Amino acid sequence: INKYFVVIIYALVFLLSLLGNSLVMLVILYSRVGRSVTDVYLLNLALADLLFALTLPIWAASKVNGWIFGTFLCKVVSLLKEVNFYSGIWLLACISVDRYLAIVHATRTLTQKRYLVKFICLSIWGLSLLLALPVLLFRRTVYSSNVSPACYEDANWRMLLRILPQSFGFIVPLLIMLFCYGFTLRTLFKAGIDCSFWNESYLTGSRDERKKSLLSKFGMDEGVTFMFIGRFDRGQKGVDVLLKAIEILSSKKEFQEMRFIIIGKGDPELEGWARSLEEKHGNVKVITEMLSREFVRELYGSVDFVIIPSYFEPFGLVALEAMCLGAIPIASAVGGLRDIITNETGILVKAGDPGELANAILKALELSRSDLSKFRENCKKRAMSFSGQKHREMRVIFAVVLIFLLCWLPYNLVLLADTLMRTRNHIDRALDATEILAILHSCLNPLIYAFIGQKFRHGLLKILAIHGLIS
Ligand SMILES: CC[C@@H](Nc1c(Nc2ccnc(C(=O)N(C)C)c2O)c(=O)c1=O)c1cc(C(C)C)co1
């Protein structure tokens, strides 16, 4: 029956994990050079999967006939399969902690004191053994009426020893993983800009001289400048908020002190309102033309402030470009924009309020009195921090975690469903199908490195070239 197939898959995975993880441990251990804190954690993960692989042929014979191998051998096998999970899930959380402090925050960890990394994973294996200590007490050979011997568990303390590793060995590292991986992915998405195009170095002369010449080119008098480079639309780029803010500013004396440049094509009702304001005020300029990135670069450097009153912005790409050339952004607190803009690098406002934006334009007017040379420079530093990219290296780790959860989450979710049922054939075969999914993981990580793992790929053929391989 289905029993023959199980033994095939078990023997098939066993080999793919043995060779797989052994190759991975070799490639990591061969050269100490270039090996990172993450490479150390991935090496421990490879060993955790390598140990669990060893129990698979004993588990294969356990399907044909029951658990005959011994009461002791149950504890041996049961500890390795539990330790492999708790260690593997905790090692993945340590990768998250390292990558969070390194990508979303600009802080390298344990680089100077690399000896401490060894103690971290030693602690991981230890905590993993203590988490799996109750199964060393309650897991043995269980005999029943007319059925083959089996390997499974059986007071109030026994449930506590099952509830304690359920939350601290599954939910606690998972919680840390969701916060860290989630917020790293968020900032990973944001940087798409190339500092080879948008840079301060490419600009000629000084930012105040570039401004006076821009105004002279735009037929406007000397003063503080505000720029808009979004699309003319309702409910997305919020040009209507800007045209209404200009309208309420119109009545004030401080309005004559400032100049406005509203660039963008779109909505004919918004195009009209922008042209009417241009024709009425000598300090308002509107460009319907679709300008080239070379001209926009000259604008970002010369103009003092860039206003982004966008209702929805998933990525602050227009702010990233503006900040890379040293323009203080007056953007509404929305997606991407709340993250990139700090009280040190721009002004944040309420999304759909034209009254509050006018007060931010007025606030920016008063802040310009003092030399904002450092404030403009801070924006260049902050945008650039986002500019550095690891995104390609991380694509491997995201595949690792994605596949880990796709293999272990269905087993743990079915585990809760059958334990809380006490406290069916459809749910019995469900646990039989989620079992083989968690087994398949044991050989998947090496395959991921063999597919998209750029350090492992090159590193493996680097060793092959040293000994055998040629041309
Ligand atoms: C799985 C084995 C493989 N490790 C790999 C990656 N790891 C990393 C992934 C993301 N971020 C880091 C990191 O934290 N930084 C500081 C770059 C990694 O290290 C890969 O990508 C990849 O492949 C490897 C490494 C080596 C040598 C360097 C010893 C040989 O094989």
Side-chain angles (χ1 to χ4, degrees), residues 1-3 5-107 109-157 159-161 163-292 294-296 298-423 425-471:
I1 58 124
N2 298 295
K3 288 181 182 186
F5 149 86
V6 172
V7 189
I8 280 170
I9 313 308
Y10 273 32
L12 191 121
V13 165
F14 167 80
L15 297 158
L16 271 144
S17 46
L18 237 175
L19 317 170
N21 293 279
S22 293
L23 218 80
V24 170
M25 288 169 83
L26 165 103
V27 178
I28 296 162
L29 290 164
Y30 197 81
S31 190
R32 184 185 285 157
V33 175
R35 181 168 79 218
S36 70
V37 181
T38 320
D39 294 322
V40 181
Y41 295 148
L42 292 162
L43 171 79
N44 279 275
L45 213 89
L47 170 68
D49 277 309
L50 195 271
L51 282 146
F52 169 60
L54 299 162
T55 62
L56 293 164
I58 317 142
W59 268 134
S62 165
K63 300 284 170 179
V64 179
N65 319 94
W67 198 266
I68 337 119
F69 322 108
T71 55
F72 150 86
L73 245 109
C74 194
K75 288 158 179 185
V76 173
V77 165
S78 296
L79 182 77
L80 305 194
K81 74 166 179 180
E82 281 274 79
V83 158
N84 143 258
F85 181 79
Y86 299 123
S87 64
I89 204 155
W90 269 105
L91 282 160
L92 279 173
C94 296
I95 290 170
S96 336
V97 162
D98 237 68
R99 304 296 94 225
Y100 184 90
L101 291 159
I103 82 109
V104 52
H105 291 73
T107 20
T109 353
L110 312 139
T111 76
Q112 228 279 273
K113 288 171 107 192
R114 268 293 291 260
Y115 77 98
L116 290 162
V117 191
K118 294 108 204 298
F119 301 102
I120 294 152
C121 42
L122 194 86
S123 171
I124 291 304
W125 282 101
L127 183 93
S128 191
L129 199 86
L130 261 79
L131 248 15
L133 197 84
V135 307
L136 207 87
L137 331 165
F138 316 127
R139 282 215 154 194
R140 47 156 59 253
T141 309
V142 45
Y143 296 106
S144 282
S145 184
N146 300 109
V147 203
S148 299
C151 260
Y152 52 84
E153 274 166 273
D154 302 326
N156 270 100
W157 296 98
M159 184 79 262
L160 286 156
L161 261 70
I163 283 304
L164 206 133
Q166 254 181 268
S167 189
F168 294 94
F170 174 75
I171 297 139
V172 163
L174 195 258
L175 220 92
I176 288 153
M177 271 186 271
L178 291 174
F179 292 129
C180 291
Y181 287 125
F183 294 132
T184 52
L185 249 161
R186 166 156 262 207
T187 56
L188 279 199
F189 275 92
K190 301 175 182 180
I193 185 181
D194 57 295
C195 297
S196 189
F197 212 132
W198 319 94
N199 214 295
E200 196 271 295
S201 67
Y202 290 85
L203 301 156
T204 48
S206 185
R207 51 208 79 256
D208 71 281
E209 284 120 65
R210 288 182 233 133
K211 194 175 88 183
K212 290 163 211 290
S213 59
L214 182 106
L215 286 158
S216 173
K217 201 183 87 71
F218 286 179
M220 292 197 285
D221 275 290
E222 198 188 284
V224 293
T225 48
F226 298 95
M227 194 185 143
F228 184 77
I229 195 78
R231 182 141 226 271
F232 281 37
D233 64 51
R234 290 160 287 175
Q236 286 154 78
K237 297 285 173 180
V239 58
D240 56 306
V241 183
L242 186 64
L243 297 173
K244 198 63 204 175
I246 292 156
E247 265 217 8
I248 79 140
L249 284 164
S250 175
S251 69
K252 272 77 97 174
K253 195 254 182 171
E254 295 94 320
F255 180 68
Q256 306 313 123
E257 290 172 53
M258 41 202 176
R259 319 281 167 265
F260 299 92
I261 308 141
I262 312 113
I263 315 159
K265 204 169 94 186
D267 224 307
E269 60 172 74
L270 273 311
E271 275 187 332
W273 192 9
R275 283 280 171 207
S276 303
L277 280 160
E278 181 205 34
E279 287 142 50
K280 285 268 182 180
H281 311 286
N283 53 352
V284 175
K285 249 279 278 185
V286 289
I287 317 156
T288 50
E289 302 168 341
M290 284 167 151
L291 277 88
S292 180
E294 333 305 319
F295 309 115
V296 198
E298 282 279 78
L299 274 141
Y300 287 146
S302 57
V303 181
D304 301 321
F305 300 93
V306 166
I307 306 160
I308 316 102
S310 293
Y311 281 91
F312 195 85
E313 192 80 12
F315 45 92
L317 215 136
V318 278
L320 269 148
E321 292 157 323
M323 286 156 88
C324 274
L325 289 116
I328 305 148
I330 314 161
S332 56
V334 295
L337 296 170
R338 189 212 174 266
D339 314 64
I340 191 162
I341 300 139
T342 333
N343 59 93
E344 303 159 79
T345 50
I347 311 151
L348 286 162
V349 274
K350 295 184 211 169
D353 194 41
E356 243 113 48
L357 181 73
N359 287 123
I361 292 153
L362 284 159
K363 230 287 151 193
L365 180 102
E366 282 302 304
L367 286 153
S368 188
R369 273 88 159 94
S370 300
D371 273 57
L372 298 166
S373 306
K374 188 55 74 270
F375 211 96
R376 277 168 139 266
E377 272 284 342
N378 291 349
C379 296
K380 286 191 256 267
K381 266 103 83 184
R382 268 284 284 167
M384 297 217 153
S385 317
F386 291 70
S387 186
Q389 150 211 146
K390 324 73 185 172
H391 191 41
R392 254 283 143 198
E393 293 237 42
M394 277 301 273
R395 212 184 145 261
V396 178
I397 292 165
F398 290 117
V400 164
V401 185
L402 177 82
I403 286 150
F404 178 87
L405 298 163
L406 280 160
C407 290
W408 279 112
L409 220 84
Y411 185 84
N412 297 307
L413 289 157
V414 162
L415 197 101
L416 281 144
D418 279 65
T419 50
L420 280 148
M421 205 194 188
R422 289 220 296 165
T423 57
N425 182 52
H426 303 269
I427 220 149
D428 201 7
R429 205 171 180 91
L431 213 141
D432 184 35
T434 58
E435 240 170 66
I436 207 144
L437 246 175
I439 279 142
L440 264 147
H441 182 260
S442 206
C443 77
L444 279 161
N445 277 311
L447 254 114
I448 280 307
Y449 317 136
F451 261 98
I452 55 162
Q454 308 294 321
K455 279 184 169 184
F456 173 75
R457 281 225 279 184
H458 291 98
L460 178 68
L461 52 106
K462 234 182 94 282
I463 305 156
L464 296 160
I466 282 158
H467 309 263
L469 265 295
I470 164 160
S471 288

